[PDB]
Amino acid sequence: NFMLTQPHSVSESPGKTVTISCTGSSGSIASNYVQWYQQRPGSAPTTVIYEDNQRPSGVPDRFSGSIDSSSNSASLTISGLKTEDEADYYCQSYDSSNHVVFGGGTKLTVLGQPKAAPSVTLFPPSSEELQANKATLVCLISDFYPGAVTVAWKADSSPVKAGVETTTPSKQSNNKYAASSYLSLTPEQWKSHRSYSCQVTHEGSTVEKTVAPT
Amino acid sequence: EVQLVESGGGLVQPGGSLRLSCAASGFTFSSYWMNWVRQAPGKGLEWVANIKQDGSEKYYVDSVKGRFTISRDNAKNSLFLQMNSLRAEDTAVYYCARVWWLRGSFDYWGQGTLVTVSSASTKGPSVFPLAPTAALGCLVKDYFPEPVTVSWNALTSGVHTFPAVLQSSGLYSLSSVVTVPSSSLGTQTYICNVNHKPSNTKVDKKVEPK
Numbered sequence: 300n301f302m303l304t305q306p307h308s309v310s311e312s313p314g315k316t317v318t319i320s321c322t323g324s325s326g327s328i329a330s331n332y333v334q335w336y337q338q339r340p341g342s343a344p345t346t347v348i349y350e351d352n353q354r355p356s357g358v359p360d361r362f363s364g365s366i367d368s369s370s371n372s373a374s375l376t377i378s379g380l381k382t383e384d385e386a387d388y389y390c391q392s393y394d395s396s397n398h399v400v401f402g403g404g405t406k407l408t409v410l411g412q413p414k415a416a417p418s419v420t421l422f423p424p425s426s427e428e429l430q431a432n433k434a435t436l437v438c439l440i441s442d443f444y445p446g447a448v449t450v451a452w453k454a455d456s457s458p459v460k461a462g463v464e465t466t467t468p469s470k471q472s473n474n475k476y477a478a479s480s481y482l483s484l485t486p487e488q489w490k491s492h493r494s495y496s497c498q499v500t501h502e503g504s505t506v507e508k509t510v511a512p513t
Numbered sequence: 514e515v516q517l518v519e520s521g522g523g524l525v526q527p528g529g530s531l532r533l534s535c536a537a538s539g540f541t542f543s544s545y546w547m548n549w550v551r552q553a554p555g556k557g558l559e560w561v562a563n564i565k566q567d568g569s570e571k572y573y574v575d576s577v578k579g580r581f582t583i584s585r586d587n588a589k590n591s592l593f594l595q596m597n598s599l600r601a602e603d604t605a606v607y608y609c610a611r612v613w614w615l616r617g618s619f620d621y622w623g624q625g626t627l628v629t630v631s632s633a634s635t636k637g638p639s640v641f642p643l644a645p646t647a648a649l650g651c652l653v654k655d656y657f658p659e660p661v662t663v664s665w666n667a668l669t670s671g672v673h674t675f676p677a678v679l680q681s682s683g684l685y686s687l688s689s690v691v692t693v694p695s696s697s698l699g700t701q702t703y704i705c706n707v708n709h710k711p712s713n714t715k716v717d718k719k720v721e722p723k
Contacts, residue, residue: 343623399548402557469676
């Protein structure tokens, strides 16, 4: 019944300190050794802490593992943060039944660039798609930092409530973030409105583009 | 070097069966416990099963009990995972992992193999032009499974192929755009190279301003 819980996300500026907790549930954190892994996008996890506080060779000492028996928790402290530290971090240990319990994971973001408003491009359905009895609105979001945006669609200024598909933002090749949002419609529904708008809100500032059936 | 190479992953309808294999190399395979651990797309790591260094005892996560079987062949340095009654929940990249001892650290992993359990069948995409310094692109729509490469090689001021979305249908959609001067439109011819190898789909599309 043992269980480990981590904060969903954590963030800080380069050169400062974060602490990712690993709270044990229905069990005892001190019963079994605790490990920490740093997995990055498109890579297999690698160990940063094993056996509560041991550091594999090469791992810098900025990474430190500790155990809090009082609160039944373990923590990985990362000081002197570098942008290269941006990754997913997982704790794991064992229960009483010879099972491997992994933590939920924590997304650590290192904010090492100035804020950047998103560049937005909106595309109406093509004639070739409408000829195939379909209609997809493509909204393209790029070059925003940090990578937290919310996307809203609006048909004749009324918020679209169905048929929206939005990607989770991903980091581009220039360390900016990019996302896509799709509004699927019928030829019927497309030609029944006079304007569509993709509204991207980033840090309390909104960038929007409008298309209109011709 | 220590190397764990997974193989045998692919796509299966709900209720089917698949068998993974892990080729071990660079160490005494028969001396170590071995693990299977999976990571659903964009989610956390979940341990599946482990096996003693000599197959004497096996342990499973409760969600796969009665459906999954871990096994090993120490003479051929092989680790297997036989999956039956596969569900869409089991969709994940399955990692072959060696643990340093029974209560040690997962010190060696493979690159993983992707198991997809979906009611969606292998479908080719529909490529539409995103007609318009201006921006124009191609829309790769409804297509399964991944991946698809897009190319415009017709010089551009810049290209960006966006990561695919998984729609509510279970099919993916992808977009890629280029940047070009706002007058080269009616002059230059801009062509995107869409290629979906899982469905033998290669499409070439001129993107022209409507």
